[PDB]
Amino acid sequence: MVQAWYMDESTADPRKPHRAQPDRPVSLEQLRTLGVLYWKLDADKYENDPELEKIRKMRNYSWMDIITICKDTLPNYEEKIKMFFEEHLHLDEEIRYILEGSGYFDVRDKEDKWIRISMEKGDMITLPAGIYHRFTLDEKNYVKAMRLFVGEPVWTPYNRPADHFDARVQYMSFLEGTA
Numbered sequence: 001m002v003q004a005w006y007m008d009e010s011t012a013d014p015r016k017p018h019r020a021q022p023d024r025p026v027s028l029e030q031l032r033t034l035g036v037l038y039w040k041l042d043a044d045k046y047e048n049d050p051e052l053e054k055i056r057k058m059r060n061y062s063w064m065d066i067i068t069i070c071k072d073t074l075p076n077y078e079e080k081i082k083m084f085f086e087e088h089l090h091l092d093e094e095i096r097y098i099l100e101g102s103g104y105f106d107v108r109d110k111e112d113k114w115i116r117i118s119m120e121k122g123d124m125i126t127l128p129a130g131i132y133h134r135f136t137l138d139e140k141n142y143v144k145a146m147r148l149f150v151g152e153p154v155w156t157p158y159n160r161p162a163d164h165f166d167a168r169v170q171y172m173s174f175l176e177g178t179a
């Protein structure tokens, strides 16, 4: 199953796992209290998968494309991966389905402590509008992912602090309502 954990107190080498000691694993159930949802799919079938279609229709993920984060092939690579990793939020869901490779999504918990979520081939995640998060490659330095969106996408990150947005206010209101 999908692995998530609280992080250690080192700020060095962000692509390493940074597991807290002793281990403090985080379950899919705890992630749901943060509004973070997850599905496991057969990523070999991504071009034609009834199971992905079910999720997309349920959630109205009407838009998708594919992105490959590779030191060589990605245009403006160095600036892009810097922007992914700055703590930020969006006014829309961030939905990513890992087709190849791997990476980490870090998200803030209810006490603003970092949880690291390890995403691998087959893993699909949605980070709710308003959640503070960031993304980094892991030490394998490669990921290929499907991006999905509810309608035509707007990718704009708002780097923390971004507390004034309605999407953030509504998300805080959502957090009051979960366990």
Ligand SMILES: CSCCC(=O)C(=O)O
Binding pocket: 067, 069, 084, 096, 103, 134, 135, 143, 144, 145
């Ligand atoms: C695994 S997708 C690459 C990261 C990304 O697209 C983002 O942080 O917005």
Ligand SMILES: [Co+2]
Binding pocket: 088, 089, 090, 094, 133, 134, 157
């Ligand atoms: Co983001």
